[PDB]
Enzyme design. Structure first.
Site, short mmCIF file in Angstrom:
data_model
loop_
_atom_site.label_atom_id
_atom_site.label_comp_id
_atom_site.label_asym_id
_atom_site.label_seq_id
_atom_site.Cartn_x
_atom_site.Cartn_y
_atom_site.Cartn_z
N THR A 179 0.90 -1.20 -0.11
CA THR A 179 0.12 0.12 -0.08
C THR A 179 0.76 1.13 -0.06
O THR A 179 0.93 2.26 -0.99
CB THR A 179 -1.09 -0.01 1.15
OG1 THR A 179 -1.84 -1.02 1.14
CG2 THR A 179 -1.86 1.37 1.06
N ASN A 206 0.71 -11.14 2.60
CA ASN A 206 -0.29 -11.05 1.90
C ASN A 206 -0.15 -11.75 0.42
O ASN A 206 -1.31 -12.27 0.18
CB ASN A 206 -0.96 -9.53 1.64
CG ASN A 206 -2.10 -9.40 2.76
OD1 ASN A 206 -2.41 -10.00 3.54
ND2 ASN A 206 -2.32 -8.13 2.85
N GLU A 254 5.89 -25.28 24.43
CA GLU A 254 6.53 -26.26 23.69
C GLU A 254 6.41 -25.84 22.25
O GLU A 254 6.20 -26.74 21.29
CB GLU A 254 5.94 -27.77 24.02
CG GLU A 254 6.11 -28.23 25.36
CD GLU A 254 4.95 -29.23 25.73
OE1 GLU A 254 5.24 -30.30 25.48
OE2 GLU A 254 3.85 -28.95 26.37
N1 LIG Z 1 -4.59 -8.72 4.55
C1 LIG Z 1 -4.96 -7.85 5.19
N2 LIG Z 1 -4.01 -6.80 5.23
C2 LIG Z 1 -4.21 -5.81 6.05
C3 LIG Z 1 -5.38 -5.51 6.80
N3 LIG Z 1 -5.05 -4.35 7.27
C4 LIG Z 1 -4.06 -3.67 7.28
N4 LIG Z 1 -3.37 -4.71 6.45
C5 LIG Z 1 -1.92 -4.51 6.01
O1 LIG Z 1 -1.48 -3.20 6.09
C6 LIG Z 1 -0.63 -2.32 5.42
C7 LIG Z 1 -0.73 -0.95 5.67
O2 LIG Z 1 -0.78 -0.88 7.22
P1 LIG Z 1 -2.10 -1.05 7.94
O3 LIG Z 1 -2.03 -2.28 8.65
O4 LIG Z 1 -3.20 -0.88 7.13
O5 LIG Z 1 -2.12 0.09 9.23
P2 LIG Z 1 -0.88 0.42 10.13
O6 LIG Z 1 0.42 -0.28 9.63
O7 LIG Z 1 -1.05 -0.28 11.48
O8 LIG Z 1 -0.74 1.82 10.29
P3 LIG Z 1 -2.03 2.45 10.28
O9 LIG Z 1 -2.52 2.74 8.92
O10 LIG Z 1 -1.94 3.87 11.07
O11 LIG Z 1 -3.07 1.86 10.93
C8 LIG Z 1 -1.49 -2.72 4.07
O12 LIG Z 1 -0.57 -2.92 3.07
C9 LIG Z 1 -1.99 -4.08 4.32
O13 LIG Z 1 -1.13 -5.06 3.75
C10 LIG Z 1 -6.30 -6.33 6.64
O14 LIG Z 1 -7.51 -6.29 7.12
N5 LIG Z 1 -6.10 -7.26 6.04
#
Ligand SMILES: Nc1nc2c(ncn2[C@@H]2O[C@H](COP(=O)(O)OP(=O)(O)OP(=O)(O)O)[C@@H](O)[C@H]2O)c(=O)[nH]1
Ligand SMILES: Nc1nc2c(ncn2[C@@H]2O[C@H](COP(=O)(O)OP(=O)(O)O)[C@@H](O)[C@H]2O)c(=O)[nH]1
Ligand SMILES: Nc1nc2c(ncn2[C@@H]2O[C@H](COP(=O)(O)OP(=O)(O)O)[C@@H](O)[C@H]2O)c(=O)[nH]1
Ligand SMILES: [Mg+2]
Lengths: 439, 430, 103, 97, 430
Positions: A179, A206, A254
């Protein structure tokens, strides 16, 4: 008396939990209201929900969960969503401003005003619990908030509790699909903190999940919730052996004492199967033999790193369903002979066996169907060095001229910390190379 | 929570803002009378973002309407939805601008800015927590560029930690609108870089070009042109007002879209936009829809993007779309057009998702891009200034109200610096 | 409308036959739009701003017209759709051994 | 059975508290109107007496089922056994201006 | 039960009281004939504070109206609410004052102050326990200054155990309405300070300032000015007549606002205030009420409250409000602006609450504060007085009633020290 506590931080962890806890509810039979459906329960599972639930005093139930997210967007939806009555109303810490993919932002200025509440909630949850076996942490590193809060929280947890074990299901960036472009910085920064505080971790990239979704379920256009469902299944299969009777139980303690050669190398990459829908299965296989072969198939692996590029150290396979014992030995013997998957020199015996009785359960209206048994495997092979090699190349190119550096530098994170992170990461890659040198 | 203030300036701006509040009112369902007639439950959870609350159950946009001539503000009040604005939120002078920078930023604007400055602070502290700033103005005009930018510096002074954006119709030489356009433009760009974090130009030249080529309505008028730009900022703040898979606030774009502190010039675009006669014939799929977004002529700025190479890109898909199609389509576009993207920054296409799409569509994409092709825009403006400046023409008005050519000399210096520095990366190699 | 008055197959004729109406262009004289009044507020310079005759709004509907799609539902809610779960509850074992209605 | 000049007294205490929970710059109709749409799922504008028990149960008021039926029935003019949120919330704004 | 008598003299004095009775009657709901048609019982419980009991159930307000020229009285009873005042109370002469201080305190009044003191004594004895006096008169006015000032002098000498209030209007420099204002005005302050425990200045400029700026009435008349001050008087005596969370009588307000025996000059301000065209574009919230309270323009006194440091402050909210909100906001304002509050006495503002808001609104605030900024009003008035005296201009009028220059010379000295003492307690630190 043998219970666990769950830690979820970040939107990714929140979404994964939204399915994990719903499946947890479905398998033990607990409605969203918190009231058990009776139906002549007469203690059918009796002492069964201790492992993931605690008594409310009269009637309802309260899952042992803690939710953290600096952005209220998903917190509110979970609060007013399908499970309004389940979680503790005050146990859902709600943020005020988003981290906006700034690791330094999430670790030194805004993070200091919520870790106190996180520690307070964890203390309250654990103290009432009697036999806290460890921690279960879900977080995302492909962004700011995830790492910025999770790494610091784990750091504080270690000094607060100490030797107690901990496991983490992080989600690193995919080799091709992602992303944000600031993701490499967050990954590099987070690995520094996570390489010396967590013991057992699993990569769940992913890209592999999408690949597996395309091949088996025959759903060309998968969704995020559908992706989360498989992770929920993996977690359920991993933790099933801890709360049900079986011929041979493998407690959470374990895994590290079974799957980590040295204190430093403690990263494992795992997979789940079989993955067959409700349409193209019943006319099919799943004699016990083929599941074990499908477990070691390269394309089915939950990480975009071919295990064929390295040796093997130790893998623990836990069967769930009605698998008769001797089938496990038969499958292991068959897998060992084949030359496609080879082991390292220094570990002659490297398989762990665990048999539990409960068949995997399915949620309504999902892509998963009901079969009579399945196998979940956790693997740590030298191939995993490739993923850290690739994340290495990206960082250097865009750090050559301090791309996007200012957003971090002006936020408090000293410019010298990037030097430390890169040096330590380079140290890690060297580490994995030597262990594979033949004797 | 995390509400954002809105600022208006200049006649060009005044037309943008009024129509901009047009689109939001319906989606939230607030009628001309300010009463609620919504349909979905999810439409109020975040109504507080743009609207306050007041006794009697009526809502008012937290807006600032501001310009130096009474005629401009008269139209907005008497027109549609002119009854949503609090009278205390209006500030106006009595002398007018007359396309003179000095009259807007030193003498005439300063005496009345104090009244305008005071108004914003009172509203700013009223909200629970400021999240950012959006300013609707124009650079080639009289009152905006001079008296509008000054408010940009003043607001930034007291609030060093809040990010802000800007909307500006930079002028195009082809469809000329004023002889003195080069002055008030280059003079304006000078001060915008030092304080304005986010600025996404909108070129009127594209409006006609976009209107006739794809829209192809018989006689497009000022009503429609302002309308298409209206949706651009409607979806920019999408994550804040609706739930979604991957929420993205304004700052997330800031961190992921500005590689360096100064290089903060974006060109935006909107899609889909189909004619009144081809409404029902195009399939609705990520594949077909994404082709339009990166098309050369779908961009909203006169600059041709294919002439240069991009640095970073972020497009916020609105509505229920299967993310995988979003992810996979991103890879294909980034591979078949590698030569048009700078090499040293890998994985340079951002993605985002939301739950609620604009009324009447299941897909909607708001593309925000930071492309080197914007240099030609400044180059086109800059070159005229050097030619006409050498003759000292049109210079007696400016020098007679507190402007000294010693200041003008610096201005051209800043414009060239950005023009020269910006293109270093285009040829830069790892 | 290519140097003509439509209804004639001049260049680019397919579209203009479908115009909504655009009341402004066919009534330039009625004007009206006089609804501001001497409010005495918005504002005082004490003299209220002079009110001028504003002309027609000029229609709109530039954005794609409604495709009969109200939408306005959240992605998450339909994902779990608590309606899905209950169907796997207090129901089943249905093969109609005999005839009996139900909800 | 009881419906003396004590049911209306609860209305004041019921109202007095409502302004307690009300967020700043809000009308009791706004706070209540959200409540009747939170617990409910039918969305046709009706819930059972127990659901109305849940709605007021959130407010913190402690009453018996007998008194509970009193207000619902007192608020159930037609005797249909269901409550409409539009009239309920609007009437409260009348008393608390 | 602590019933307070109302005394007001002078042509200007009559008009303000002519309305102050108008609003106060509305609050208790007494009809022009004086028969009760109220709504609730709370409006009738403490009716003894102002109206006594007489035949027929109607009430005669305890008003002693006085003046020296018949022009005022013939019109006071000619308007709405001209039947409440009793025929016997009125006392007035057939000569006139002619805007001369001397004839109003030594020659004519000497033969007419006997009657006024006669009725004033009778009313007080009637009260179960007199709680205080309230006086409204105009210093610049002729009869009010002389007859009014003498009454305070005599009344103090008979009942030293009761508190005295004073609503006074002192002519300002900008809006000029009398050429002999400096002389008679100066004599007012000297005689006023030594006797009046409390005083609240009300400059005409603010009343005009409030109307032309906030309320936005095209052509305000003197009627409007009376109402704004009339409402303020309603605030100070608020709790003493209705139940509430924290009672606050007249003495308590003095205890919290007169740090030393001499500094006894106040400045009042009334909120909320918004135009009829802006009533429905605003929100009535406790945060909004507090902001307007301390803003300079809201106050009805010429002195700028931002040129000094407050010594003490008081607050009297109205209606039903959350106690915690009153405390939290009050702490906040005093904290963010320490520079405008002196440093040697913390907790420098008092608060009170009542449970009966004025008709027509829901929340309101009445402010009675003592600020060192009040020194401007006397400094400007004194500056002009010295100019007149040095030329012995217009002096022959004052010498014609027996007064010598000694009283004039002393008046300047005492008005000098009162100027000095405000200076001392302002610029002094721990
Ligand atoms: N498969 C999957 N990937 C997710 C999901 N939510 C976030 N991601 C992964 O997280 C990446 C972006 O970061 P986020 O997890 O959305 O959020 P963060 O890294 O905690 O930072 P924030 O945007 O502030 O929440 C994306 O490229 C996704 O690959 C989800 O619900 N399913
Ligand atoms: N595309 C477009 N441009 C506009 C519109 N209104 C004004 N402008 C531009 O604004 C410029 C005039 O600026 P002006 O309002 O006079 O600046 P001001 O005098 O400071 O208020 C013109 O060159 C126009 O190109 C509009 O509705 N659409
Ligand atoms: N604000 C206000 N001031 C008034 C009004 N009527 C009279 N005055 C003031 O009273 C002054 C005249 O005072 P004067 O009649 O000589 O007082 P008197 O000798 O006691 O009767 C004028 O300068 C006015 O400023 C009124 O209705 N409102
Ligand atoms: Mg996030």
């Amino acid at each position: 008396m043998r219970e666990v506590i769950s830690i979820h931080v970040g939107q990714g962890g929140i979404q994964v939990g939204n399915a994990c806890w719903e499946l947890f509810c479905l398998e033990h039979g607990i409605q969203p209201d918190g009231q058990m459906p009776s139906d002549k329960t007469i203690g059918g599972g009796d002492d069964a929900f201790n492992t993931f639930f605690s008594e409310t005093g009269a009637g309802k139930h309260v899952p042992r969960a803690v939710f953290l997210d600096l952005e209220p967007t998903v917190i509110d939806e979970v609060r007013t969503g399908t499970y309004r009555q389940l979680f503790h109303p005050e146990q859902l810490i709600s943020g005020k401003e988003d981290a906006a993919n700034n690791f330094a932002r999430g670790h030194y200025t805004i993070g200091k005003e919520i870790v106190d509440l996180c520690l307070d909630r964890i203390r309250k949850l654990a103290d009432n619990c009697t036999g806290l076996q460890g921690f279960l942490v879900f977080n995302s590193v492909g962004g700011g908030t995830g790492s910025g809060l999770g790494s610091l929280l784990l750091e504080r947890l270690s000094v607060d509790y100490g030797k107690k074990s901990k496991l983490g299901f992080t989600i690193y960036p995919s080799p091709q699909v992602s992303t944000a472009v600031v993701e490499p910085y967050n990954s590099i920064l987070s690995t520094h903190s996570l390489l010396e505080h967590t013991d057992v971790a699993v990569m769940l990239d992913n890209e592999a999940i999408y690949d597996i979704c395309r091949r088996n379920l025959d759903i060309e256009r998968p969704t995020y919730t559908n992706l989360n469902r498989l992770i929920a299944q993996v977690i359920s299969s991993l933790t099933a052996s801890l709360r049900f009777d079986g011929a041979l139980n493998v407690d959470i303690t374990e895994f590290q004492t079974n799957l980590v050669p040295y204190p430093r190398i403690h990263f494992m990459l795992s997979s789940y199967a079989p993955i067959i829908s409700a349409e193209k299965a019943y006319h099919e296989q799943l004699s016990v033999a083929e599941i074990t072969n499908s477990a070691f198939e390269p394309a089915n692996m939950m990480a975009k790193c071919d295990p064929r590029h390295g040796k093997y150290m130790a893998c623990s396979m836990m069967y769930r369903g009605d698998v008769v014992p001797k089938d496990v030995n038969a499958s292991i013997a068959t897998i060992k002979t084949k030359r496609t998957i080879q082991f390292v020199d220094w570990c002659p015996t490297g398989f762990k066996v665990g048999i539990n009785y409960q068949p995997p359960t399915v949620v309504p209206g999902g892509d998963l169907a009901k079969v009579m048994r399945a196998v979940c495997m956790i693997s740590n092979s030298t191939a995993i060095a490739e993923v850290f090699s690739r994340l290495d190349h990206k960082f250097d190119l865009m750090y050559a001229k301090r791309a996007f550096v200012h957003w971090y530098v002006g936020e408090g994170m000293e410019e010298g910390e990037f030097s430390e992170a890169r040096e330590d990461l380079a140290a890690l890659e060297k580490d994995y190379e030597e262990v594979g040198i033949e004797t | 929570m995390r509400e954002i203030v809105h600022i208006q300036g200049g006649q060009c701006g005044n037309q943008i803002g009024a129509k901009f509040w047009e689109v939001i009112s319906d989606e939230h369902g607030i009628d001309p009378t300010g009463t609620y007639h919504g349909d979905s439950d999810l439409q109020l959870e975040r109504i507080n973002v743009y609207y306050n609350e007041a006794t009697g159950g009526r809502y008012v946009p937290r807006a600032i309407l501001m310009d130096l001539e009474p005629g401009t503000m008269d139209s907005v009040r008497a027109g549609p939805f002119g009854q949503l604005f609090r009278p205390d939120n209006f500030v106006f002078g009595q002398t007018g601008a007359g396309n003179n920078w000095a009259k807007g930023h030193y003498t005439e604007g300063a005496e009345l800015i104090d009244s305008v400055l005071d108004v914003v602070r009172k509203e700013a502290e009223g909200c629970d927590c400021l999240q950012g700033f959006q300013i609707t103005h124009s650079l080639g005009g009289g009152t905006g560029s001079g008296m509008g930018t000054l408010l940009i510096s003043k607001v930034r002074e007291e609030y060093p930690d809040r990010i802000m954006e800007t909307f500006s119709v930079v002028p195009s030489p082809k469809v000329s609108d004023t002889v003195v356009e080069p002055y008030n433009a280059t003079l304006s760009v000078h001060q915008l870089v030092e304080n304005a974090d986010e600025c996404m130009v909108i070129d009127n030249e594209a409006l006609y070009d976009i209107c006739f080529r794809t829209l192809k309505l018989t006689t497009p008028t000022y009503g429609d042109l302002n309308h298409l730009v209206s949706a651009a900022m409607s979806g920019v703040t999408c994550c804040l007002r609706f739930p979604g898979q991957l929420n993205s606030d304004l700052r997330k774009l800031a961190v992921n879209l500005i590689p360096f502190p100064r290089l903060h010039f974006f060109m935006i675009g909107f899609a889909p936009l189909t004619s009144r006669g081809s409404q029902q014939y195009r399939a609705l799929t990520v594949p077909e829809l994404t082709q339009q977004m990166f098309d050369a002529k779908n961009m909203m700025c006169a600059a041709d993007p294919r002439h240069g190479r991009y640095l970073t890109a972020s497009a916020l898909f609105r509505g229920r779309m299967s993310t995988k199609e979003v992810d996979e389509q991103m890879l294909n576009v980034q591979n078949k057009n590698s030569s048009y993207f700078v090499e040293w920054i890998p994985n340079n296409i951002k993605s985002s998702i939301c739950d609620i799409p604009p009324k009447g569509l299941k897909m909607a994409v708001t593309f925000v891009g930071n492309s080197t092709a914007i240099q030609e825009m400044f180059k086109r403006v800059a070159e005229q200034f050097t030619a006409m400046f050498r003759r000292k023409a049109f210079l007696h008005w400016y020098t007679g109200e507190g402007m000294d050519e010693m200041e003008f000399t610096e201005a051209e210096s800043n414009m060239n610096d950005l023009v020269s520095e910006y293109q270093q990366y285009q040829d830069a190699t790892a | 409308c290519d140097k003509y008055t439509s209804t004639a197959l001049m260049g680019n004729w397919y579209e203009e036959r479908l115009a909504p109406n655009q009341p402004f262009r066919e009534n330039l004289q009625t004007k009206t739009v006089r609804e501001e009044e001497a409010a005495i507020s918005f504002a005082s310079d004490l003299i209220p701003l002079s009110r001028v005759n504003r002309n027609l709004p000029w229609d709109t509907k530039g954005v794609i017209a409604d495709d009969g799609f109200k939408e306005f539902r959240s992605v998450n809610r339909t994902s779990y759709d608590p309606i899905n779960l209950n169907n796997y509850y207090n129901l089943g074992d249905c093969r109609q051994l005999y005839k009996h209605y139900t909800a | 059975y009881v419906s003396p000049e004590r049911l209306n007294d609860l209305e004041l205490i019921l109202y007095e508290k409502i302004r307690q929970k009300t967020l700043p710059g809000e009308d009791e109709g706004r706070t209540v109107y959200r409540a009747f749409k939170y617990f409910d799922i039918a969305e046709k504008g009706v819930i059972d007496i127990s659901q109305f028990k849940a709605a007021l149960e959130k407010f913190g008021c402690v009453f018996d089922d007998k008194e509970i039926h009193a207000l619902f029935s007192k608020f159930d003019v037609n005797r249909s056994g269901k409550i409409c949120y539009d009239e309920f919330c609007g009437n409260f704004a009348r008393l608390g201006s």
